[PDB]
Enzyme design. Structure first.
Site, PDB file in Angstrom:
ATOM      1  N   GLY A  53      88.187  39.163  34.628  1.00  0.00           N
ATOM      2  CA  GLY A  53      88.673  38.899  35.970  1.00  0.00           C
ATOM      3  C   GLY A  53      87.328  39.437  37.002  1.00  0.00           C
ATOM      4  O   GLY A  53      86.587  40.387  36.806  1.00  0.00           O
ATOM      5  N   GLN A  54      87.182  38.600  38.015  1.00  0.00           N
ATOM      6  CA  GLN A  54      86.167  38.731  38.856  1.00  0.00           C
ATOM      7  C   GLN A  54      85.801  40.214  39.330  1.00  0.00           C
ATOM      8  O   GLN A  54      86.635  41.005  39.606  1.00  0.00           O
ATOM      9  CB  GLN A  54      86.281  37.652  40.052  1.00  0.00           C
ATOM     10  N   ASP A  55      84.696  40.558  39.638  1.00  0.00           N
ATOM     11  CA  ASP A  55      84.143  41.920  40.083  1.00  0.00           C
ATOM     12  C   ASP A  55      84.781  42.149  41.419  1.00  0.00           C
ATOM     13  O   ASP A  55      85.101  43.317  41.593  1.00  0.00           O
ATOM     14  CB  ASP A  55      82.814  42.073  40.514  1.00  0.00           C
ATOM     15  N   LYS A  56      85.368  41.317  42.306  1.00  0.00           N
ATOM     16  CA  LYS A  56      85.968  41.357  43.508  1.00  0.00           C
ATOM     17  C   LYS A  56      87.259  42.383  43.125  1.00  0.00           C
ATOM     18  O   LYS A  56      87.508  43.072  44.188  1.00  0.00           O
ATOM     19  CB  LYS A  56      86.372  40.229  44.097  1.00  0.00           C
TER      20      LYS A  56
END
Ligand SMILES: Nc1nc2c(ncn2[C@@H]2O[C@H](COP(=O)(O)OP(=O)(O)O)[C@@H](O)[C@H]2O)c(=O)[nH]1
Ligand SMILES: C[C@H]1CCC/C=C/[C@@H]2C[C@H](O)C[C@H]2[C@H](O)/C=C/C(=O)O1
Ligand SMILES: [Mg+2]
Lengths: 162, 195
Positions: A53-56
């Site tokens: 999952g993306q760092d966002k």
């Protein structure tokens, strides 16, 4: 007491929690949202945590990383091509400020396979010996049969208790 | 001729049962039997959106979160209208048309496509990234709050603290986050037909 179980996809996290389960097969309607794979053993709660999952979205992980005494890292001992990727994930999890004092348990899973790296080799590939301040143990296992699963959880338990 | 209509319906039903078990095969059958004009993302999205109530919603969700179905997902979500709705209200509408998948990666794609669509639909004013985080946090809260496997539920303050800095670099106003929190807490997101 809380423990998170991480590992690259296909390492065997789900399989391990299946064996440890034994509990009444879900006969209820699934709750809309994320899959929750958790179990209790000797008053300790172990929960599978997807590190993908993306760092966002990482900031939303903060709440769940609080009060974490241990990390269980699952790695496919037969996946030589992704072993280095596994080391990076482990090192990113151990670097989490919230897990600085966490006790580490590595399950060198899939030891049943013919060309599975042994515990010694895994210890080397994951750079476990380079960790200067960290309490850890590595346990050879085979999730499908249950070998090593309890031997490793019992070591972890004994380390958090005393 | 006096049987055409009834026979046509049966043809449709068998296509659906085929779709429900194998999405791709069902869609090919539907296009071949003339229920869908073509295999374009646009025609398939329209069919799914409109016949949602006749198809297996779990199958729809697994089709839409398939990494290679990017455009189909975008086209599908483009059929909604979220103008003037708050994030949690829009998410509830989105989730009435298909069953959200359970793996984080699958949920992420859905939330990604939903966010960019919801954001564009508005042109508290969260940018694209803030809507994404907020929406992702809502799916999280629904699980945290009603999944029987979860032991300790977030309190409003937990939910609130966890979102610090996610509003264009700063914090969402407290009353706003409380409304969202209470909304999910008191009204779980579920599939009505299921109960
Ligand atoms: N041979 C062998 N296969 C295993 C073992 N543990 C898991 N698997 C298999 O590896 C695949 C992925 O395991 P899973 O638990 O789903 O991985 P997860 O993605 O980490 O949840 C499945 O097909 C399992 O049956 C093991 O100890 N030995
Ligand atoms: C304790 C429960 C809370 C439910 C909400 C958490 C969602 C996490 C977000 C992450 O990126 C995937 C999930 C991560 O896999 C969490 C697993 C889990 O069982 O979490
Ligand atoms: Mg799994």
């Amino acid at each position: 007491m809380r423990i998170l179980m991480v590992g690259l996809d296909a390492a065997g996290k789900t399989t391990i929690l299946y064996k440890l389960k034994l509990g009444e097969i879900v006969t209820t309607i699934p709750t809309i949202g994320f899959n929750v794979e958790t179990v209790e053993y000797k008053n300790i709660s172990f929960t599978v945590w997807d590190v993908g999952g993306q760092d966002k979205i990482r900031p939303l992980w903060r709440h769940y990383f609080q009060n974490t005494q241990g990390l269980i890292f699952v790695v496919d001992s037969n996946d030589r091509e992704r072993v280095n990727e596994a080391r990076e994930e482990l090192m990113r999890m151990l670097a989490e400020d919230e897990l600085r004092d966490a006790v580490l348990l590595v399950f060198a899973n899939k030891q049943d396979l013919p060309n599975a790296m042994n515990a010694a080799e895994i210890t080397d590939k994951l750079g476990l010996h380079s960790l200067r301040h960290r309490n850890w143990y590595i346990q050879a296992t085979c999730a499908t049969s249950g070998d090593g699963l309890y031997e490793g959880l019992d070591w972890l338990s004994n380390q958090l208790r005393n | 001729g006096s049987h055409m209509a009834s026979d046509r319906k049966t043809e449709f039903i068998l296509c659906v049962e085929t779709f429900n078990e194998k999405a791709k095969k069902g869609i090919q059958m539907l296009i071949e039997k003339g229920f869908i004009d073509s295999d374009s993302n646009r025609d398939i999205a329209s069919f799914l959106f409109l016949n949602n109530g006749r198809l297996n919603k779990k199958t729809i969700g697994l089709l839409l979160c398939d990494p290679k179905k990017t455009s189909l997902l975008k086209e599908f979500i483009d059929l909604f209208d979220f103008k003037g709705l708050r994030v949690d209200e829009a998410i509830r509408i989105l989730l009435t048309k298909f069953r959200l998948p359970g793996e984080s990666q699958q949920i992420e794609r859905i939330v990604e496509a939903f966010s960019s669509k919801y954001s564009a639909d508005q042109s508290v004013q969260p940018d694209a990234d803030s809507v994404f985080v907020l929406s992702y946090s809502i799916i999280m809260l629904n699980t945290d709050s009603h999944n029987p496997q979860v032991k300790d539920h977030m309190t409003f303050d937990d939910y609130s603290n966890n979102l610090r800095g996610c509003y264009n670099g700063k914090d969402f106003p407290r009353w706003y986050l409380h409304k969202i929190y209470t909304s999910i807490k008191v009204k779980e997101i579920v599939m009505p037909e299921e109960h």
